[PDB]
Design a binder for these strands. Structure first.
Length: 279
DNA sequence: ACGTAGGGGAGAATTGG
RNA sequence: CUUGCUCGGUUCGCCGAGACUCCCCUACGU
DNA sequence: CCAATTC
């Protein structure tokens, strides 16, 4: 199950103000700093509505309007597994000590866990919120158009030589001999690997011209949690199914992300979300 | 600032109002 | 083989050559 | 139609 990465196009509000992130951060901030007696007392979290509904009342963790069951089970199983990770580490670090031969516990005089886990900013998606083809009617308004999910996707730049002179993608005459006779990736005109600062490049970088060219031919997929929608560029998905030999040139969007899981993992600060290959 | 070293993590197929 | 990314040619129009198991967090060397 | 239940 190898990973594939996708760039983000637009979102209404940033991922910090998302209730799914705020609830996770609030839950994580409350749990890591708990004594070994508090984790067992407060570990009475189930996989049911009524179990989680009152768990916030007893523990007092803020709720920012997040009540979805599976979303809560993706930030409560994980938070207690990170908590157990430090104790298991010093217990597996106890295991190496045991092999060599009181102990090196993970609780100080205050009783708290001294090597407190850091807050994990990953926002884990679930089945009820999965990427779908961006339909202009159902989903909110965005400038970039959405493709039909049933029609096959276009093949990128066929017959590169047969491109008008003076129009983007033109291969000059002195350069047509000694071209790649073997198959490789076909980089686009607006590719940044052709336009970047190099001692030998006299060309001018203009980020406005290139980036606008990039999203007109984009492949948008959308994930909506509450009243927040994130829209992406499903071309890293397309390249992943191309350089790996699992796909052909003509392939529909509905079938493109069927290769991937319905649970993307987002990176709020880096601006990238990672897919995986469902097997 | 950097290897390292070592804990966490990366669905989906029914069922019920 | 439409994005992204590393290393090179270049007539600056784009070309050839690559990588693709990654993110988070706590620690310890230089 | 889509969260809660479930492994």
């Amino acid at each position: 199950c190898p990973p594939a990465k996708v760039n983000i196009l637009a979102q209404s509000r940033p991922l910090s103000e998302w209730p799914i992130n705020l609830v996770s951060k609030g839950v994580q901030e409350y749990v890591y700093g708990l004594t070994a007696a508090e984790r067992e007392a407060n570990g009475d979290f189930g996989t049911s509505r009524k179990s989680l509904d009152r768990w916030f009342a007893r523990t007092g963790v803020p709720t920012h309007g997040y009540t979805t069951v599976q979303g809560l089970n993706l930030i409560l199983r994980h938070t207690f597994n990170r908590y157990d990770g430090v104790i298991k580490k010093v217990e597996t670090r106890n295991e190496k000590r045991r092999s060599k031969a009181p102990e090196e516990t993970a609780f100080g005089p205050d009783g708290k866990l001294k090597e407190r886990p850091g807050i994990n900013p990953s926002i884990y998606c679930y089945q009820q919120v999965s990427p779908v083809p961006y339909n202009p009617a159902k989903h909110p308004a965005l400038p970039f158009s959405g493709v039909d999910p049933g029609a096959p996707l276009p093949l990128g730049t066929p017959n590169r030589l047969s491109i008008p002179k003076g129009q983007p993608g033109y291969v000059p005459e002195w350069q047509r001999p000694h071209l790649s006779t073997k198959n490789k990736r076909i980089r686009k005109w607006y590719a940044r690997a052709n336009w970047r600062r190099k001692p030998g490049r006299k060309s001018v970088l203009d980020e406005a011209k290139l980036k606008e060219a990039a999203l007109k031919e984009a492949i948008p997929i959308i994930v909506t949690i509450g009243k927040d929608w994130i829209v992406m560029d499903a071309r890293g998905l397309l390249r992943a199914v191309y350089w790996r030999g699992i796909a052909k040139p003509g392939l529909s969007l509905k079938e493109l992300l069927g290769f991937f899981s319905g649970d993307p993992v987002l990176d709020p600060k880096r601006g990238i979300a990672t897919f995986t290959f469902k097997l």
